[PDB]
Amino acid sequence: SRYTTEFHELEKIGSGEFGSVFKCVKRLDGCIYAIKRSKKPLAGSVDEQNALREVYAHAVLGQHSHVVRYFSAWAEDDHMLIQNEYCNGGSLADAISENYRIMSYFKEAELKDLLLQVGRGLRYIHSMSLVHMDIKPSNIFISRKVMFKIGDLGHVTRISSPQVEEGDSRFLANEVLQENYTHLPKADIFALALTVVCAAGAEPLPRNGDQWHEIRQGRLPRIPQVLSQEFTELLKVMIHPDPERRPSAMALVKHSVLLS
Ligand SMILES: C=CCn1c(=O)c2cnc(Nc3ccc(N4CCOCC4)cc3)nc2n1-c1cccc(C(C)(C)O)n1
Numbered sequence: 001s002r003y004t005t006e007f008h009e010l011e012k013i014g015s016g017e018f019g020s021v022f023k024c025v026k027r028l029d030g031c032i033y034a035i036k037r038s039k040k041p042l043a044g045s046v047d048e049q050n051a052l053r054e055v056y057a058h059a060v061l062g063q064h065s066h067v068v069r070y071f072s073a074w075a076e077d078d079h080m081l082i083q084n085e086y087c088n089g090g091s092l093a094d095a096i097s098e099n100y101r102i103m104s105y106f107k108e109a110e111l112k113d114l115l116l117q118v119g120r121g122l123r124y125i126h127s128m129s130l131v132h133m134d135i136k137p138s139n140i141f142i143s144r145k146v147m148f149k150i151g152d153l154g155h156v157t158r159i160s161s162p163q164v165e166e167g168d169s170r171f172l173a174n175e176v177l178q179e180n181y182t183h184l185p186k187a188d189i190f191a192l193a194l195t196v197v198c199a200a201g202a203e204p205l206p207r208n209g210d211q212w213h214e215i216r217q218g219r220l221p222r223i224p225q226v227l228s229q230e231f232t233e234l235l236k237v238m239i240h241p242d243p244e245r246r247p248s249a250m251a252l253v254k255h256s257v258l259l260s
Protein backbone atom coordinates (compact mmCIF):
# COMPACT_ATOMS: atom_id res chain seq x y z
CA SER A 1 0.00 0.00 0.00
CA ARG A 2 1.45 3.33 -1.14
CA TYR A 3 -0.29 5.23 1.67
CA THR A 4 1.13 3.03 4.44
CA THR A 5 4.47 2.69 2.66
CA GLU A 6 5.09 6.37 1.93
CA PHE A 7 3.40 7.98 4.95
CA HIS A 8 2.90 7.52 8.67
CA GLU A 9 -0.50 8.51 10.04
CA LEU A 10 -0.33 11.00 12.94
CA GLU A 11 -3.80 12.36 13.59
CA LYS A 12 -7.25 12.48 12.02
CA ILE A 13 -8.04 16.13 11.30
CA GLY A 14 -11.23 15.75 9.26
CA SER A 15 -14.15 13.39 8.66
CA GLY A 16 -17.50 13.36 6.84
CA GLU A 17 -19.35 11.98 3.83
CA PHE A 18 -16.10 12.67 1.94
CA GLY A 19 -14.26 10.09 4.04
CA SER A 20 -11.42 11.30 6.27
CA VAL A 21 -8.41 13.61 6.25
CA PHE A 22 -5.20 12.76 8.10
CA LYS A 23 -2.18 14.66 9.27
CA CYS A 24 0.68 12.49 8.00
CA VAL A 25 4.45 12.61 7.90
CA LYS A 26 6.06 11.50 4.65
CA ARG A 27 8.86 9.06 5.51
CA LEU A 28 11.23 10.16 2.75
CA ASP A 29 11.31 13.91 3.44
CA GLY A 30 9.99 14.17 7.00
CA CYS A 31 7.41 16.82 6.06
CA ILE A 32 3.80 17.05 7.23
CA TYR A 33 0.97 16.68 4.71
CA ALA A 34 -2.81 16.67 4.87
CA ILE A 35 -4.01 13.51 3.13
CA LYS A 36 -7.66 12.97 2.25
CA ARG A 37 -8.78 9.36 1.95
CA SER A 38 -12.18 8.65 0.41
CA LYS A 39 -14.18 5.71 -0.89
CA LYS A 40 -13.77 5.77 -4.66
CA PRO A 41 -17.04 7.31 -5.82
CA LEU A 42 -19.47 5.45 -8.05
CA ALA A 43 -18.40 6.04 -11.65
CA GLY A 44 -20.64 8.71 -13.15
CA SER A 45 -21.85 10.34 -9.95
CA VAL A 46 -21.72 13.71 -8.17
CA ASP A 47 -18.76 12.67 -6.03
CA GLU A 48 -16.75 11.50 -9.05
CA GLN A 49 -17.39 14.75 -10.87
CA ASN A 50 -16.40 16.69 -7.77
CA ALA A 51 -13.33 14.50 -7.50
CA LEU A 52 -12.41 15.06 -11.15
CA ARG A 53 -12.75 18.83 -10.80
CA GLU A 54 -10.07 18.80 -8.09
CA VAL A 55 -7.35 16.80 -9.91
CA TYR A 56 -7.93 18.67 -13.13
CA ALA A 57 -7.89 21.95 -11.18
CA HIS A 58 -4.28 21.31 -10.15
CA ALA A 59 -3.44 20.20 -13.70
CA VAL A 60 -4.03 23.87 -14.49
CA LEU A 61 -3.07 25.72 -11.32
CA GLY A 62 0.28 24.45 -10.05
CA GLN A 63 1.43 26.57 -7.10
CA HIS A 64 0.51 29.79 -5.25
CA SER A 65 1.13 31.10 -1.75
CA HIS A 66 -2.59 31.64 -1.05
CA VAL A 67 -3.78 28.32 -2.45
CA VAL A 68 -3.25 25.08 -0.54
CA ARG A 69 -0.54 23.28 -2.46
CA TYR A 70 -1.36 19.97 -4.13
CA PHE A 71 1.42 17.36 -4.34
CA SER A 72 -0.10 14.06 -5.45
CA ALA A 73 -3.25 12.02 -5.93
CA TRP A 74 -3.74 8.30 -6.44
CA ALA A 75 -6.23 5.47 -5.99
CA GLU A 76 -5.91 2.07 -4.33
CA ASP A 77 -8.08 -0.46 -2.47
CA ASP A 78 -11.01 1.25 -4.22
CA HIS A 79 -10.13 4.37 -2.24
CA MET A 80 -8.86 7.69 -3.54
CA LEU A 81 -6.13 9.69 -1.86
CA ILE A 82 -5.00 13.28 -2.28
CA GLN A 83 -1.87 14.67 -0.66
CA ASN A 84 -2.02 18.38 0.15
CA GLU A 85 0.03 20.92 2.05
CA TYR A 86 -0.62 20.79 5.81
CA CYS A 87 -1.73 24.12 7.24
CA ASN A 88 -1.06 23.96 10.97
CA GLY A 89 -3.66 26.56 11.93
CA GLY A 90 -6.62 24.54 10.71
CA SER A 91 -9.42 26.22 8.77
CA LEU A 92 -10.89 29.69 9.23
CA ALA A 93 -13.99 27.87 10.47
CA ASP A 94 -12.05 26.21 13.30
CA ALA A 95 -10.51 29.56 14.17
CA ILE A 96 -13.91 31.28 14.24
CA SER A 97 -15.29 28.55 16.52
CA GLU A 98 -12.29 28.84 18.85
CA ASN A 99 -12.71 32.63 18.93
CA TYR A 100 -16.24 32.18 20.26
CA ARG A 101 -15.19 29.50 22.78
CA ILE A 102 -12.51 31.60 24.52
CA MET A 103 -14.28 34.83 23.56
CA SER A 104 -11.58 36.31 21.35
CA TYR A 105 -11.92 37.98 17.95
CA PHE A 106 -10.26 39.06 14.71
CA LYS A 107 -9.28 42.73 14.77
CA GLU A 108 -10.63 44.84 11.89
CA ALA A 109 -6.99 45.01 10.81
CA GLU A 110 -7.02 41.21 10.72
CA LEU A 111 -10.29 41.10 8.76
CA LYS A 112 -8.72 43.28 6.07
CA ASP A 113 -5.64 41.02 6.01
CA LEU A 114 -7.87 37.96 5.56
CA LEU A 115 -9.74 39.69 2.74
CA LEU A 116 -6.58 40.75 0.93
CA GLN A 117 -4.90 37.35 1.18
CA VAL A 118 -7.84 35.24 -0.01
CA GLY A 119 -8.37 37.96 -2.63
CA ARG A 120 -4.87 37.29 -3.96
CA GLY A 121 -5.65 33.59 -4.17
CA LEU A 122 -8.84 34.32 -6.10
CA ARG A 123 -7.04 36.75 -8.40
CA TYR A 124 -4.63 33.98 -9.33
CA ILE A 125 -7.33 31.33 -9.79
CA HIS A 126 -9.42 33.67 -11.95
CA SER A 127 -6.37 34.55 -14.05
CA MET A 128 -6.13 30.86 -14.95
CA SER A 129 -9.72 31.11 -16.22
CA LEU A 130 -11.06 29.07 -13.31
CA VAL A 131 -13.48 29.82 -10.47
CA HIS A 132 -13.55 28.19 -7.03
CA MET A 133 -17.33 28.18 -6.46
CA ASP A 134 -17.18 27.07 -2.82
CA ILE A 135 -15.52 29.85 -0.85
CA LYS A 136 -16.47 29.70 2.81
CA PRO A 137 -14.62 29.64 6.17
CA SER A 138 -14.23 25.83 6.21
CA ASN A 139 -12.35 25.96 2.88
CA ILE A 140 -9.88 28.65 3.92
CA PHE A 141 -6.85 27.24 5.72
CA ILE A 142 -4.32 28.89 8.02
CA SER A 143 -0.54 28.55 8.25
CA ARG A 144 1.06 30.20 11.27
CA LYS A 145 2.92 35.51 10.91
CA VAL A 146 -0.27 34.24 9.27
CA MET A 147 -1.01 32.95 5.77
CA PHE A 148 -4.54 32.27 4.53
CA LYS A 149 -4.82 29.71 1.74
CA ILE A 150 -7.73 28.62 -0.44
CA GLY A 151 -8.41 24.88 -0.31
CA ASP A 152 -10.99 22.25 -1.31
CA LEU A 153 -10.93 22.62 -5.10
CA GLY A 154 -13.75 20.12 -5.68
CA HIS A 155 -16.18 22.72 -7.06
CA VAL A 156 -13.63 24.43 -9.30
CA THR A 157 -14.80 24.99 -12.86
CA ARG A 158 -13.90 26.93 -15.97
CA ILE A 159 -15.05 30.50 -16.52
CA SER A 160 -15.42 30.10 -20.28
CA SER A 161 -16.88 26.57 -20.28
CA PRO A 162 -19.07 26.80 -17.14
CA GLN A 163 -19.92 23.48 -15.50
CA VAL A 164 -21.54 24.28 -12.17
CA GLU A 165 -22.05 22.26 -9.03
CA GLU A 166 -23.47 24.85 -6.62
CA GLY A 167 -21.53 25.58 -3.45
CA ASP A 168 -22.83 26.00 0.09
CA SER A 169 -26.21 27.74 -0.04
CA ARG A 170 -25.22 30.06 2.82
CA PHE A 171 -22.55 31.71 0.64
CA LEU A 172 -24.22 31.34 -2.75
CA ALA A 173 -25.00 34.35 -4.98
CA ASN A 174 -28.54 34.57 -6.32
CA GLU A 175 -27.52 34.72 -9.97
CA VAL A 176 -25.85 31.29 -9.67
CA LEU A 177 -29.04 29.93 -8.13
CA GLN A 178 -30.78 31.56 -11.12
CA GLU A 179 -28.49 29.50 -13.38
CA ASN A 180 -26.73 32.62 -14.65
CA TYR A 181 -23.08 31.61 -15.09
CA THR A 182 -21.90 34.57 -17.18
CA HIS A 183 -19.96 36.14 -14.28
CA LEU A 184 -18.92 33.26 -12.02
CA PRO A 185 -15.80 35.04 -10.73
CA LYS A 186 -18.16 37.52 -9.03
CA ALA A 187 -19.85 34.62 -7.24
CA ASP A 188 -16.51 33.91 -5.54
CA ILE A 189 -16.34 37.59 -4.53
CA PHE A 190 -19.83 37.44 -3.02
CA ALA A 191 -18.85 34.37 -1.01
CA LEU A 192 -15.59 35.90 0.20
CA ALA A 193 -17.48 38.89 1.55
CA LEU A 194 -19.79 36.67 3.59
CA THR A 195 -16.75 34.66 4.71
CA VAL A 196 -15.22 37.81 6.18
CA VAL A 197 -18.57 38.67 7.76
CA CYS A 198 -18.49 35.30 9.53
CA ALA A 199 -14.95 35.98 10.73
CA ALA A 200 -16.08 39.39 11.98
CA GLY A 201 -18.46 37.67 14.39
CA ALA A 202 -21.78 37.67 12.55
CA GLU A 203 -24.56 35.28 13.58
CA PRO A 204 -24.81 32.02 11.60
CA LEU A 205 -25.80 32.65 7.99
CA PRO A 206 -29.24 31.58 6.70
CA ARG A 207 -29.55 28.60 4.34
CA ASN A 208 -32.80 29.99 2.91
CA GLY A 209 -35.95 31.93 3.79
CA ASP A 210 -36.41 35.66 4.38
CA GLN A 211 -32.98 36.50 5.82
CA TRP A 212 -31.36 34.65 2.91
CA HIS A 213 -33.10 36.84 0.33
CA GLU A 214 -32.47 39.98 2.39
CA ILE A 215 -28.73 39.37 2.02
CA ARG A 216 -28.93 38.83 -1.74
CA GLN A 217 -30.72 42.19 -1.86
CA GLY A 218 -27.34 43.60 -0.82
CA ARG A 219 -27.82 43.97 2.93
CA LEU A 220 -25.03 42.81 5.26
CA PRO A 221 -25.73 40.64 8.30
CA ARG A 222 -25.30 42.32 11.71
CA ILE A 223 -21.61 42.62 12.72
CA PRO A 224 -21.13 43.04 16.49
CA GLN A 225 -17.80 44.89 16.26
CA VAL A 226 -16.71 48.38 15.30
CA LEU A 227 -15.89 48.40 11.58
CA SER A 228 -15.12 51.60 9.69
CA GLN A 229 -17.96 52.81 7.46
CA GLU A 230 -15.49 52.44 4.58
CA PHE A 231 -14.56 48.79 5.14
CA THR A 232 -18.29 48.10 5.53
CA GLU A 233 -19.00 49.81 2.22
CA LEU A 234 -16.51 47.49 0.54
CA LEU A 235 -18.18 44.38 1.96
CA LYS A 236 -21.59 45.72 0.94
CA VAL A 237 -20.64 46.26 -2.71
CA MET A 238 -19.13 42.76 -2.76
CA ILE A 239 -22.65 41.37 -2.17
CA HIS A 240 -24.29 43.78 -4.63
CA PRO A 241 -27.36 42.21 -6.36
CA ASP A 242 -25.73 43.15 -9.68
CA PRO A 243 -22.59 41.01 -10.00
CA GLU A 244 -21.02 43.52 -12.41
CA ARG A 245 -20.99 46.10 -9.61
CA ARG A 246 -18.97 43.72 -7.45
CA PRO A 247 -15.22 44.26 -7.77
CA SER A 248 -13.11 41.67 -9.53
CA ALA A 249 -10.38 39.91 -7.56
CA MET A 250 -7.81 42.18 -9.20
CA ALA A 251 -9.75 45.34 -8.33
CA LEU A 252 -10.15 43.96 -4.81
CA VAL A 253 -6.43 43.39 -4.16
CA LYS A 254 -5.66 46.95 -5.31
CA HIS A 255 -8.30 48.60 -3.20
CA SER A 256 -7.25 51.40 -0.91
CA VAL A 257 -8.97 50.22 2.17
CA LEU A 258 -6.89 47.08 1.86
CA LEU A 259 -3.55 48.59 1.06
CA SER A 260 -2.01 47.09 3.01
C1 LIG B 1 -6.74 17.25 2.00
C2 LIG B 1 -7.97 17.76 2.18
C3 LIG B 1 -8.24 19.18 2.23
N1 LIG B 1 -7.46 19.76 3.30
C4 LIG B 1 -6.29 20.37 3.04
O1 LIG B 1 -5.77 20.54 1.91
C5 LIG B 1 -5.75 20.79 4.24
C6 LIG B 1 -4.59 21.47 4.62
N2 LIG B 1 -4.40 21.72 5.94
C7 LIG B 1 -5.29 21.33 6.90
N3 LIG B 1 -5.00 21.64 8.19
C8 LIG B 1 -5.74 21.34 9.31
C9 LIG B 1 -7.12 21.09 9.30
C10 LIG B 1 -7.81 20.80 10.49
C11 LIG B 1 -7.15 20.78 11.74
N4 LIG B 1 -7.83 20.49 12.90
C12 LIG B 1 -7.17 19.72 13.93
C13 LIG B 1 -7.90 19.81 15.31
O2 LIG B 1 -9.33 19.67 15.16
C14 LIG B 1 -9.87 20.67 14.29
C15 LIG B 1 -9.29 20.47 12.87
C16 LIG B 1 -5.76 21.04 11.74
C17 LIG B 1 -5.06 21.32 10.55
N5 LIG B 1 -6.41 20.67 6.50
C18 LIG B 1 -6.65 20.39 5.20
N6 LIG B 1 -7.67 19.74 4.62
C19 LIG B 1 -8.77 19.31 5.31
C20 LIG B 1 -8.78 18.97 6.72
C21 LIG B 1 -10.04 18.63 7.27
C22 LIG B 1 -11.22 18.67 6.51
C23 LIG B 1 -11.11 19.06 5.12
C24 LIG B 1 -12.29 19.13 4.19
C25 LIG B 1 -12.19 18.02 3.11
C26 LIG B 1 -12.35 20.54 3.53
O3 LIG B 1 -13.53 18.93 4.87
N7 LIG B 1 -9.91 19.40 4.54
Ligand SMILES: [Cl-]
Pocket residue numbers: 182183184185186
Ligand atom coordinates in the same frame (compact mmCIF):
# COMPACT_ATOMS: atom_id res chain seq x y z
CL1 LIG C 1 -16.48 38.33 -14.49
